[model samples]
Target: SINDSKILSLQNKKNALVDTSGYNAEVRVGDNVQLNTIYTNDFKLSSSGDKIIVNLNNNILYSAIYENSSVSFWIKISKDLTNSHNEYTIINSIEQNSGWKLCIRNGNIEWILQDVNRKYKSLIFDYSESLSHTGYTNKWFFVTITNNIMGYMKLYINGELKQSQKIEDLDEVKLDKTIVFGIDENIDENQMLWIRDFNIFSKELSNEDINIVYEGQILRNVIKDYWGNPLKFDTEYYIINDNYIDRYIAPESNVLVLVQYPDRSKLYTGNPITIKSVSDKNPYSRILNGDNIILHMLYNSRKYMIIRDTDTINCVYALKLQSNLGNYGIGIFSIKNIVSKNKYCSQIFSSFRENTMLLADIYKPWRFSFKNAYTPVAVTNYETKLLSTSSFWKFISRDPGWVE
Candidate 1:
């Protein structure tokens, strides 16, 4: 599984700490979360449920300096307006407190491996950020540094190969010094940055492994709440207006359902919707398809179901009423307390530029009514795995609305 590969790298014996935003560990805010395989010495903290602090202790931190061995350092970090220094360190190891560190240059979108002594030997690459989102927001960028056996090194951005370098008999890296985040241990809090899912491997990662982690790190592309958080999963949210939606998933979230129809006028192809309202001025409609159109949810040994349409109205009716339901045409999902890709489904899809209502009948139909005619785009953890650069371009060729 991707989870296992993430924490326990291929070089199991020399595997250093793999921190996925401190997941799987029950550390509360300000509590310490261990990083080393032995679960001793170094630990981290979520200071205020906002920032991650890698607090090093007196124990010996792990290193990657074995003979014929290469190390890879991966981290997702961002800088705020608070600092101006050109260098923002991710992992700093020094030779007499004067050497190697992995960091991002302040103003540019670049990653660098700096060695104070071997100035000519450091590797740097341009890994720019997209302007469509903000650096401070939850939109994370995936980065990987694969040090290939000291002979060469490779850099990746969002799982895409960006740069590689070959060197002339590079000297053995001395990891004898204390390792710290943000900056050198002597420096105080002058840099404002956030980091998550920091991992290190004793050996270089393969292209396939890099791609898998890239795919796994991406969040579901859907409409976000006003505050930049993902809409609650397993919850029904109605899109009543022409507002824009962005893809961002909170750590604790599952599936998302996007119910939509491009043209409201082109809805209801079958028999005419019956006007059974209390007044003739108000028309009413209800749709029911074969039992095949169902909603399946798992809770322990039990499975819950909800039926809707697979024939005329193609919407997958997944309305399972839980407490704290949203307004009319809105429902939400709450996944169990596990951080993984256990969420599943079938025939997942969404729309180009379509409008959706969670449960339109939530108001009891006092106003003019319309049939529940919409295409169901069943989105879940399973569907996101199908996305690839080739597949994305193929989809864009067909749906111009998704170009944005």
Candidate 2:
């Protein structure tokens, strides 16, 4: 009875939303429901009646059709708000009467349902503010509609209930006709719709159940370092001992630098280093080629990565050096610093430190060798002196449990 309450489930598979609800419904194109005109990759409506029809004539659908049901799906629309002022039908199942249709009008969701007596009841939910806030164009939104035989219907957007109303004498809906996604009777060539994880349950899902369904489809932005280790943020670190080779160089004063590792022995006040992109302030923003980045250390309240250019030694420090133009802007290189000029932000191992400490400088060339399977190290000449080093540095979108 895994699918006892589940009537239909359509999800993206091989670029198309196919039925996985055990009913094995045949999905076809065009309004005729018999045409073989199939869209494989991108489903674009070029003319009126351009729709993806799900033929539901099988006995399973007839037995699963219930008075109380819920439909949930993720939809992304490509509507040009600047030039196009059109109402786009997202999904439609109404024929003559006795079905439901979900449409978008001026950034608002309009759901219309017809009962057995052909009585039309509609609900208009204003989602314009949320659309504008999150950018209306090309964004996937999870929408759920639930109908209760007790004469009420509810609408949910991204798992949050937005609207609910009572329909007078609501009864069973005749769904013998095929369900259409995209344009049904309306013609809007400028709008393109993408649907994923379309589900229909024979019974009205509870709030928690709806949330569980939404959570299953929610995408998380997780960031990992070159070694696939998530960076710790805003956490205090200490040096276990002086023999600790895995250590990051931090500034002790305006001039002196201290090579330290994160441990519990002696706590470094400026423990966590904040990595940020210069173009976009979003911490979770993807680091692209030619992106200027800066690392901020709390120790000296410095915003740049300073390279100490002394007469004898040239070492990189995370804190800002006094009056030194601040070589803080780090450029993304494909390897050390490009195919098509695509360079990624990486950590450079210190050659002068016998590859003991991980420095924030790209002066030396690094490459992946047969010795280490996951980490990149300094080239041959410097590789010989490499005791231990981590070349993979990453900006993580979420706290990957590095800190308690």
Candidate 3:
């Protein structure tokens, strides 16, 4: 019965795409700002709203530390020494390129600091006596300087005191100036620098303050600081990134699994496993946090076909996702693994339909098995996500031979 039609009407009404800019601070800096990416010829991380990005790429990466007072902070460099004349630098534009400086000039290792304008200037060395970290990326370190009229400076790599110098000439150097961060051309354009975590202070940091960050407890139960360490009283440290990256290394065969928590909280480790039954009723069970969605595949055409219309009611590019047979269930689409080819996990080449939402697992049946499917429900707007059970996985009964 091709619908003994008095007449049947199908239409969509809304339009949109999913927005994923950032958490905490989502401001952008650069020209021709697109939606999800960030571009910059040069910039300070302070603009990322992250006070911690020490420097990305700069000719002179500098910031003001209060005078009449000593200040301290953690600095780590991503030692790329292949380029010549590179510098591990922090110089004052107003202070005549002097006052607590760390840089490389003419292949010479320079760690210059003054304790009192001209009273005493000391030179520090790093093994071969150079700021150019001609080493591996696995080597991480910290640098903290004290800006007193007669204070000292120190560089620590992996908790061990590596180098230090006393400066007596910079006691009067002013500490109010704009900071620029990036790879200093260093007379060598090919050499660049990358660093993370730039915190400041009004007082000298204790060996304790520095050690706590390196050896802090996991504070599993209570609220934690950005680094996952238990927050100690008034101590403060904010992270620019959660240190969590969506880096999925290749896994073994028949073992395609998804762990919602990147840090992998122990409690909910095994609950969301795949079941043996692949019927039309419940294809997948996802977390309520809803931030994490992991599907086995999704297809726009098979799940929701793209239809174009200029009609006023529902004329638009839309994805229809549903099976007339009571076969599918709805949930978020988490990990999109095109390699899984698991029938539930998929890649979207769909023409950008607005409100691109997921129509979870719709299990329309086949001869001896069930075919799994998921798609976005159609709409006329840039995107619309609303869907119904009828158009939701109802194909399980309509066509019993559908595959992924």
Candidate 4:
């Protein structure tokens, strides 16, 4: 509900936050926001080398801090407690001792505030005690800190008040230095960190306001399948045929293997398909859903996955997809092409070319098994085959390799 009073907003993007607040505050260092390379569309602070600096000499940031301070941000850290002894600075504005800092030390939240007179106050909250009820690691935390010079300084996590202290007769805090994020005076690289949706408000936020902000942050969109499970990035999945258990779609001679609905009830006749060996150095592979989950070929002149209107036979040699033609409803077992009016991608007998498996459509969708390891065909149809053909499939994670 609050907009104009919010002075600074930093989302996940590289050098993207300009002087949108009209105060000329900008990133002075660490312009290249580190991206989580394994996951597309996810950007964050990844290491000690990923620290960033935002100039605070401008009026907008200064007004927010000196007037009535309220800062909120979301952070995700590695669950590994190997370096629990190391102190990590999440954000720091106090240089020469006149501002505030938020840090993590010994698996606890440390809030440090200093006034212009160098009078300092520190507060610590046990991270495990605060989150023990839910007990989830590698989770995103929403933290909000507010300091009202006349009243008190408070800290809230996930919209719940965690700690507060009364403020009395302290000199006004001044910001004469830049705000640093991800690292402080010393670099600690033992763990990974990601930050997003950092905001600064000109007025101290109430409990209700903080709750609203927390809800807003949690409501950010994520892509999910029909069963409500999120599609994981950098995870490998086997696109196996539902009808033919032993025969799975494998990359061969650049042609993807397609599945048939077994109308003729003929066994798949071809070379034994082996799981494509993946690179251990670069293990992350991804399937990106474009404008409408429209399938397309990256190699061989950038073709699309479309069904010929004449034959209803889908081929990689195809559009951006017409309206809803390519939209798909991905579930655990089946991949339903939504725009095609509930039809699923299936396999057909006969190779389009030498080893190129022909892909088509059938009323029954194809089922797949996404196992990390190979096993004797597990207990598991739609009779359709979804082929992830091409060696370039492994390279798609490096860049935007799909089209709308």
Candidate 5:
């Protein structure tokens, strides 16, 4: 039944692509900035009115720290050591490459911090010598340094102390100068880097303070005494982008199966699952945490379907979360083994249509079995996270057909 004279309408209302211009600490709240897509440049993670994300590659610095006080923060670096002479000023209080400094220079994987005064100069803290992480890989470390006339400094990787040393002769340390960050770039032009949870304190941090962040806590959750009580640590900013486009198109009879919350709070291989659609009116029990959803085929053309299977073989059909302070996150699995189970997960293309967010594309051909489905994921502005770490996994755990 094509239905009287009424038919489906396919129109493109928004053509704006996501993008980011770089780190603008003064980023206005109401400005509608385009984010970056996975394949394009990079994206920013920010909320309107109070969010401000930055691109590490660009020369960005935050003059928000106290003029002359010890500071500490957590940083994760995606160590790519191919490019030489890549200098990055993580935090500088010196005059244009001159005073007390926190930086990474040359091609070494270590970070540098020292007083530039001729009268009270002491040994420089070579972050490389602190821990067994002499080389750079994918990892996050906790770093704390002091700007006092005399004190101590330390570096930690994954909650364990990697290096430490005593400080003296910083008598001329300038605390009233502007603190710069992300200004020195020594990375390959094609590579991407990020610095997360970058918090600072006015006083030198103790071993316990640094350990707290290394264990998983954020800046605001623990640190206090902000620079003159300015609203420095109250908000966060970063970019969000994936390798997909924001197109408003879909197939009608799209069947979808969504899954979440791992069974043991750990990664498992042979977990069995089933997907059922609300439209199908087939109430499916045995689902964990109501973590499954089902949709029937519509009259229009669709591209994907959700199924349950084992290993790389699509067998029984099936289906399949977020946040802070908790020890777990969400997981999304899309099955297309029916066509080719070689790679069950795709690139995950997504979009926003009239307050509803839809995902498609990624991997290839067979998509998230749903005829152009729409879920109301209330996102009023740009800062509302669309989906950054809702990690994707292949439902390939030995060919265990239907969990009957």
Candidate 6:
């Protein structure tokens, strides 16, 4: 009958160990496996198929993994670290000679205090050693520890906010003492450390929900560094400031204003996208309409891609802007040209001129496709011509075989 009740018996057998990376803790518990420490202070967990693959650059080793209370690990390091300084440790105590002694030090947990148990403790370490600084490359750095008293600890480096500290009168430790995550046997017992994803988040994730789970939704505008690394937004303001800031290296030659924070159930998940007006010249009322939004716009150039007929009828959220790089452009501006009051889409947005895509799509596609269009000042100064406007064979057209 389905294999006699699906068989699964073994509540205890010493929690099973001896899979040996050395020391043998009984082949170390299976399923998704994540735990490593070699040189025996008493640790083992890597035996179903075999794991604990480390390669931390060179020199300096100590890894630990425990989460009876709180722990998270993953330290691959190796910016060639002769000693540029690195740390992401938690609840440690080693050094029979020296190894794993950072309770929560190097990773930077500023709230520095109240840990006699109280626990709303602090230890948020987001270290990005630099992959071109803010041009991330697959960064998934996260750490959480919730309300032992009121929850606290933050360290978001690639997503901006940087560092924060707090460790007031918490209250939660009684039988504590248990939480590990790799290679800090402390002191050359046989030291070796090279980490890879070790998490134990029982709870706690704020700071915009751990930066939207460390910006991993399929990369909607990624740019993280601090060891997570990922960049190249070539601007939806670098994916709405996910970090890697380069607001066009501070653009605003004219006007650009964006501000929205809708959080009181108005529901706008993440907010703040301001692109202020430059030197203000009454830059045609640049967008405004909140309590929930939906808008679109596009007036492209990189040779061709012009779209602008905005239509944000109701308030649910359509807010758009995809891409446009070279030659003056405009994209995503619906909602009656951004709540129209007659600013005619910021006075027909201009300022951007650079061409030459084979002289712009097959030799001059309508003057490089309306190089920002709009021209008809009564034909400027027309002179159809008295003879091809006079000169050089009067611009050929006597119509013999010369029309060629």
TM-score for each model: 0.43, 0.51, 0.34, 0.53, 0.36, 0.22
Backbone clash pairs in model 3 (N, Cα, C under 3 Å; residues 3+ apart or in different chains), count:
48
Cα lDDT for residue 318, model 1? 30
lDDT of 4 by residue, 1-404 (tens): 56567777654345354435545567644656664442322345644466677875455445324567688876555544313677777788877758888887756778888887788777776654432312223345678888787888898877788788776566777644588776543543335555667778878999999988876655323332211122333332333333333343332222234433233222232222111112222222222232122233322333233321212112322111122323232101112222111111222222223122333222212124222322111111212333322110111111111111
The candidate that wins on lDDT is 2
Error of 5 at 34 (Å): 9.3
**Considering lDDT, which of the candidate structures 4 and 5 is the better prediction for this target?**
4
Residue 176 error for model 5, in Å?
3.8
- 1-404 per-residue lDDT for model 6 (tens digits): 21122111111224332322221222223354433331112222222232322222211232321112222332333222212243433233222221222332332333233433323334344343233323221223333332222433444442345544553244333322222333332322112223333332334444564444334321333222122222111112111221111211111111121223333222122222222232232322222311111112212221222222132111111112334422223232111111111111111121112110100001111212322211100111112321221100000001111111
For residues 153-202, could you state the per-residue lDDT of candidate 5 as single tens digits?
55544444555555453343333233444334434432333333344444
Q: Using TM-score, rank the candidates from best to worst.
A: 4, 2, 1, 5, 3, 6
- lDDT tens digits, residue span 1-404, model 3: 11121011111112111111111221222232121111011112212212211111211333434432222222222223422443434432224543455564433334555433444454543422342213222122334443444555655443445555554434454343333333334322223222323333444544565454333211112222211112222221111111121111111121111223344312222211121122222332211211232122223223221122222113322222232222132322222222110011222112333333323222321224343322122233323333222122100110101111
Q: After superposition, how far is residue 288 of candidate 5 from its true place, in Å?
A: 14
Worst 10 residues of 4 by lDDT: 390-399
> Which of candidates 3 and 6 is the stronger one according to TM-score?
3
- The residue-by-residue lDDT of candidate 2 on 55-166, one tens digit each, is 8745545532346788887654544421235676778887665788987777677898877677877777664454332233334567888888676888987777878878
- Model 1, 1-404: lDDT tens per residue? 43443321211123344334322322222333324311122223212232223332211443534422233333323223112345545555454523346655644434334343554345565432332222221123456767654566677765667677764355445442344454432233322333344555435677788777655433343222211222232322222211112221111112222233444322211111110111112221111111111123332334333222222222323323122312221221111111212111112122212222222211111113343222222232333334321111000011111111
| Segments of candidate 6 deviating more than 4 angstroms | 1-97, 105-180, 183-238, 241-256, 260-352, 355-404
lDDT of 3 at 383: 31
What range of 10 consecutive residues in model 6 has the weakest lDDT sum?
A: 389-398
Name the candidate, 1 or 3, with the larger lDDT value.
1
Superposed by TM-score, candidate 2 places the C-alpha of residue 27 at a distance from the truth, in angstroms, of: 1.0
Q: Clashing residue pairs, candidate 2?
A: 238-263, 333-337, 333-343, 334-343
Using alpha carbons, what is the TM-score of model 6?
0.22
The C-alpha stretches of model 2 lying farther than 4 A from their native spots are: 1-4, 13-16, 30-49, 58-65, 81-83, 134-137, 184-190, 221-404
Candidate 4 regions with alpha-carbon error over 4 angstroms: 12-19, 31-43, 60-66, 129-133, 184-190, 220-404
Against the hidden true structure, what lDDT does model 5 obtain?
0.29
